[PDB]
Amino acid sequence: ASLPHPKIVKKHTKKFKRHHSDRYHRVAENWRKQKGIDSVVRRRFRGNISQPKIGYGSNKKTKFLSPSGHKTFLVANVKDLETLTMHTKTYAAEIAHNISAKNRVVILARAKALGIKVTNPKGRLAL
Amino acid sequence: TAQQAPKWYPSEDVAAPKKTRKAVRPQKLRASLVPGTVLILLAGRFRGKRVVYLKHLEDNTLLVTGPFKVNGVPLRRVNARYVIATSTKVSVEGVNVEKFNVEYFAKEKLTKKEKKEANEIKTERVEDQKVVDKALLAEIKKTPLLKQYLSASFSLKNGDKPHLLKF
Amino acid sequence: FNSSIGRTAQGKEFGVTKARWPAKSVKFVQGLLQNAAANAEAKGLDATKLYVSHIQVNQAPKQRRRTYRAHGRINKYESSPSHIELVVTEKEEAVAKAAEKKVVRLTSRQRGRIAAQKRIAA
Amino acid sequence: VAYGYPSYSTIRQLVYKRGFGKINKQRVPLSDNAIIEANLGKYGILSIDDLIHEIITVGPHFKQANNFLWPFKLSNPSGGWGVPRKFKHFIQGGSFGNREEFINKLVKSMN
Amino acid sequence: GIDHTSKQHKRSGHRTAPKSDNVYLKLLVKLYTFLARRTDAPFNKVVLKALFLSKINRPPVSVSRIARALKQEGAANKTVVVVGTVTDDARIFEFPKTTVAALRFTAGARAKIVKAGGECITLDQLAVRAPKGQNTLILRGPRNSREAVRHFGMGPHKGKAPRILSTGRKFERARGRRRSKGFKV
RNA sequence: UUGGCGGAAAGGCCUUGGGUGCUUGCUGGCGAAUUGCAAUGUCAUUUUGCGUGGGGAUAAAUCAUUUGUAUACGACUUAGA
RNA sequence: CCUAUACUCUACCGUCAGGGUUGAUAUGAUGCCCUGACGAGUAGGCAGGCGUGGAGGUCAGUGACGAAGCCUAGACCGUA
RNA sequence: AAGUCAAGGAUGCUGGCAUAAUGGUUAUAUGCCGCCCGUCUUGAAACACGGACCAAGGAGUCUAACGUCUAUGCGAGUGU
RNA sequence: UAUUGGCGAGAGACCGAUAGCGAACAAGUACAGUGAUGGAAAGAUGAAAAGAACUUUGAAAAGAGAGUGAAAAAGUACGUGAAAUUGUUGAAAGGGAAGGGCAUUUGAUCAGACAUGGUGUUUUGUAUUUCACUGGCCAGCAUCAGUUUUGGUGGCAGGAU
Ligand SMILES: [Mg+2]
Ligand SMILES: [Mg+2]
Ligand SMILES: [Mg+2]
Ligand SMILES: [Mg+2]
Ligand SMILES: [Mg+2]
Ligand SMILES: [Mg+2]
Ligand SMILES: [Mg+2]
Ligand SMILES: [Mg+2]
Ligand SMILES: [Mg+2]
Ligand SMILES: [Mg+2]
Ligand SMILES: [Mg+2]
Ligand SMILES: [Mg+2]
Ligand SMILES: [Mg+2]
Ligand SMILES: [Mg+2]
Ligand SMILES: [Mg+2]
Ligand SMILES: [Mg+2]
Ligand SMILES: [Mg+2]
Ligand SMILES: [Mg+2]
Ligand SMILES: [Mg+2]
Ligand SMILES: [Mg+2]
Ligand SMILES: [Mg+2]
Ligand SMILES: [Mg+2]
Ligand SMILES: [Mg+2]
Ligand SMILES: [Mg+2]
Ligand SMILES: [Mg+2]
Ligand SMILES: [Mg+2]
Ligand SMILES: [Mg+2]
Ligand SMILES: [Mg+2]
Ligand SMILES: [Mg+2]
Ligand SMILES: [Mg+2]
Ligand SMILES: [Mg+2]
Ligand SMILES: [Mg+2]
C-alpha cells in the first residue's frame, strides 16, 4: 500500500561504535570521535574502525523511510491519528509507548477504519 | 501531542514516467542456428540430449523435438542461449510447423490455494508430435548412425576441452 | 578455586589431580540435603528416585575483622560466607516425542522430479 | 609533462569525445553546435569542426578557442605507458619530454 | 588530486538574506528580489543589496544632504531614495517640495518634508511608482564619520586617535607625543 | 571357489573352475512428454545412535589398607580371597 | 601481465558558486528546481545540530486498564 | 507524406518462490589486514608518564569597566 | 542609613540525601588527639503490621509448607534495585593472549510487503457480495543507452613511391 519509491540502499548498515567500547565497560558504544594525538582511529590507519562522515548520508528520496516505504509518525490519540488521513501512502502511525491498551484499541479501530498503517499493532494486547 | 507535525506533507499523486525510447527490434540469431540443425541441450530436464531444431518462435525461443520416438524429447521450446549448434544438419522440408506458436504452449496457470500436498497430456500435442516425427525419421534414415547419435546423450570426458572442441 | 593446593590420588576418580576434604562445607551441605529430603517426604515424593537437580552457591555479605601488620598498618580479615540453595527432583521418564510438522516448500521442478521418480519406480 | 605535435585525427577524437567549454565559469559538455555559436559566434566559429579548424590551423583566435576549451581530463593509457619507468626523458627510455609525433598514440590510448 | 589555485568552498563574503528577523523587511526584500530578478534594471539590485546592509553600513541621511543633492541641475524633480533612515536638520531653514522614499523617517524629518509640501514614501510605494527606478536618486550616508573609524589603523605617524576612556592633560600627551619627553611618536 | 605371492606403512596383486546377470559385435519393436524456456536440481563417503535376527567372549583398573629398592605432595616399587 | 583511497565514467552524500521559479488551487520563497566544480587535516576559528536540570506558552498531550526508572547478541529511523 | 527512430538517462517477454527464500542482526569459522589508549614531544607500541575494575561527582564560571561586530528602539538627541 | 547575630514572619526560574549548612536522622553527636583543635557516616517496608498464627525437618539459627497483604519480584539485611564482580543453567569457541575491520560460509534469531480498486454478482446475511487477476523477493532471455575490455576482417596513404 506504500507509495512507489526507489530501492532503499544503506551506505553503511553497521553501527558506528566508539573505539575500545569492546575493551572497557566504562567506555560506552555511543560514537565519540577520538581527539587524541596518536590515535590510529583518528589517523585512519588500515584495519581500524570506520568513522561517520557525510559521504555515508542516505539518499534524500529514501531518507527517513521504513522498509515498507513510509515515514513513521508517533501518535498518542485519535486526533493525532487523523492528521494522517490524506497521507496514508507516505506516513505510518506508531503508537507511543505510554499509551494504555484501552486507548490502543480505539486508535487501532480508527486506523483500520481510515486505512492508516500502524507499525506497532501489538502493544499491550491480551489473548 | 507526541510528535508535533510536519509543516508540509509530500503529495500522494504518483507521477507518470517519461515517454521511453526503447523500440523492440527482432532478434538476430547466431549464424549456426539454421532450421534442421542438431543441437545439444546444455541445461534443463533433457540436458545432454541431442535434438533437431525446427523453427525460430516469436519470443526468441527455438522450437525443437527429439524426435520423441528416438530419445523421448517431445515437441518443446527452449532458449537459444542454452544450446550448442552442432554442424550435423538434417533437412526439415516436409513438415508443416506453422501450426505451433507461443499460445500452443500454455501452462494454464495455477491458483495459490492449490498447493500440491502429495501429487494429463493433450491428445493434440501427442498427435502433433506423431505427425512431425514420422516425417523427420524418413530423413533420418538416409544418413547412417544418425538415429543412434540422437538417441545417445552427450557428456564431457576426461581431457575434453570445449574451447578446442568442434561441434 | 584450586591454585597452589596440594595434589592427591583421590582425584583419579574425577580425572583431576587436585582435591580436598572441606569438612565444614560438607556439614552444611549434608544438613541442607537432609532438610530437602524431609521436605520431599512431607510432599509425598518417591524418596528413591530423588536426584539433586539444582544446587547453587553464591556469595553472602562479607563479615569483616582487622589484621595488624608491620609498621603500624591495618588490613582486612574477612570471612566470605555463602548463600546455598538446592532442589532435589524425582527422576522422570523419557520427556517427549512427536516433533514439529516440518512444512515443506518444493519448487515445480522438484515436484516434477519426485513425480517422475514415483512413476519410474514402483 | 609529455608533449608533442598532435594530428587532426587525435584532435578530432579529443574534441568529440571529451569536449567541454567554459561557460560563465562552468564546465559545460558541448554536444551541440548551438553552444559553440552562442559563445564563439563573434569570431566566426559556428560548429565543433570550425573550432577544430581554428585549433589545428593556428588562426587569429586560437587563444579564445583554446581558453573556451576546458582542459581535457584524460585517463591513464589503456595499453600502459610502454616504458617500465615513467619519469625519465623519452630519449632515455622514459615518458616525459617531446615525443614529437608519438603523442598521438599516447593520447589515443589515454582518451 | 588537484593543485588548487584558490581556496575551496569559500563563501562569497557578501551578505544575503539579512541577519535581522524583521518580517516587514523580509517582505520588502522578497518584493525587491523579484524586481531584481525580472525588471532588468540595476536600481532594483542596488536597493536589494542595500536592504541587506547592517546599521553601520546604513548611516542616516540628513534632509540637508537631501536638499544639497536636489540642488544639482536636472534633479529638482527626482525621487530621493534612502535605503535607511532620514533624520532632520535644524541647520537649514528652507526645504524644497521633493518626494522622499525611505525605510524610516524621524518625526522631525517627516514633519519638515510634509510642511515643505512634499511627501514621505515607503519603498513599496516607490516600487509601484517606479519599478525600474524612473527618475530616482539614491543617497548614501557617510560611513567613515563614526567614532570607531577614528581608531582604525592606529600606529606611529598615522594620526589615528588612540583608544582611550578619559581625556585631557596627563592622559597620553607625554613621552611618545612630544620631543621634550623622549621622542614624538 | 582352488592355488599362490606380497612385511617398508604388507591389508593388496595374480590365478583355477563353475554359477548367475548384462553386453552397444549386429538387426528390430515398445516406452519417455507436464521438471512446462534454466534454476547442483539432489545419485558420493565419514562417523554415531537406535531397532530387529544370526553368530561369538564371559574382565580389569582405581581408591582404601600395606610395602620402602621410592618419595615435598602426586607419582614409583611391592603385598593382600 | 599484477594492482593505490592516484586518473577516466556513473550513482549517491555534503559544501561552495552561478542561476530559474509568487500565477492561479494547497500548504512550506529561509521553499522547490536546474547547472558546474570541489571534498586530507593537528593547534585553532566558525557554522548547523543531538542530549540534561529548571522556567513561560501550547498540545482541553501520556498515565494506577500502569508514569518515570532499570534489563533486553528483539525491531526501526538518523552519517552521527 | 503519414509517421517512425538507437534522437535531452530501460524497456519488453518469461519462469520460480511468495517464504526466513533474499536480506538484516548476532555468534563462530576462514582469507588478508589490525601494537594501547590519553599526554608532553622534532619524534611514542615504546625499556617515557597516568590508568586493576565499576557507579556517582568532577574543571573557561559570575561580576565591574571596556574594544570590534551584529540585532533592536529612538535619533541631534538619547537614557522611565 | 547599616545589619552573614537574635526573635517573628513571607517568599524563590535555588539544592534535592556523594547535592544543599559539617549536620533532612539521639550532629557539633559518635570518634581521634595531652591539648589547642579536628570531626564524620547514617533518610524511604506497606494505605494499614495486617511484622508470617499453625504443621513439619533441624540441637538451634533457619528452611520447606501454610497464611497476611493489591503486591513477600514489599519479610524490620525491607520502595525502585544499575554496573563492577559472582553462582547455576543453556549456547558457542579455544595448539605461547584475547579483543577489532572488510567479505562471505555455517548456526541461531528477526522485521517488512503479498489483501490491492478491478469486468465481476459463478452470491449468501440481499444490498452485503460471487470474485480471474492485483503486488513483493530472486532470477533468465531479447533489443537498447553509457563506460570499458578482448578479437576477427576490409579499404586506403607514406618510405629509396
Ligand atoms: Mg564498553
Ligand atoms: Mg603525532
Ligand atoms: Mg602455580
Ligand atoms: Mg606454598
Ligand atoms: Mg600482624
Ligand atoms: Mg603500633
Ligand atoms: Mg590490460
Ligand atoms: Mg612501471
Ligand atoms: Mg578530490
Ligand atoms: Mg544558491
Ligand atoms: Mg541546577
Ligand atoms: Mg512502564
Ligand atoms: Mg547487554
Ligand atoms: Mg539469516
Ligand atoms: Mg543470506
Ligand atoms: Mg550469519
Ligand atoms: Mg566475533
Ligand atoms: Mg599483520
Ligand atoms: Mg626528547
Ligand atoms: Mg625502547
Ligand atoms: Mg612526567
Ligand atoms: Mg601505574
Ligand atoms: Mg557523571
Ligand atoms: Mg550531606
Ligand atoms: Mg556533610
Ligand atoms: Mg509490586
Ligand atoms: Mg517492591
Ligand atoms: Mg529492594
Ligand atoms: Mg553483572
Ligand atoms: Mg553496449
Ligand atoms: Mg565491444
Ligand atoms: Mg604500399
Short mmCIF file of C-alpha atoms (C1' of nucleotides) in Angstrom, two decimals, chain D residues 17-18 78 111, chain I residues 147-150:
data_model
loop_
_atom_site.label_atom_id
_atom_site.label_comp_id
_atom_site.label_asym_id
_atom_site.label_seq_id
_atom_site.Cartn_x
_atom_site.Cartn_y
_atom_site.Cartn_z
CA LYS D 17 34.74 12.54 -27.01
CA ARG D 18 35.96 14.94 -24.31
CA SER D 78 44.77 1.74 -21.86
CA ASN D 111 41.35 9.09 -24.42
"C1'" U I 147 31.54 3.29 -19.70
"C1'" U I 148 35.12 -0.30 -20.84
"C1'" U I 149 37.75 -4.77 -22.41
"C1'" U I 150 39.15 -8.74 -25.97
#
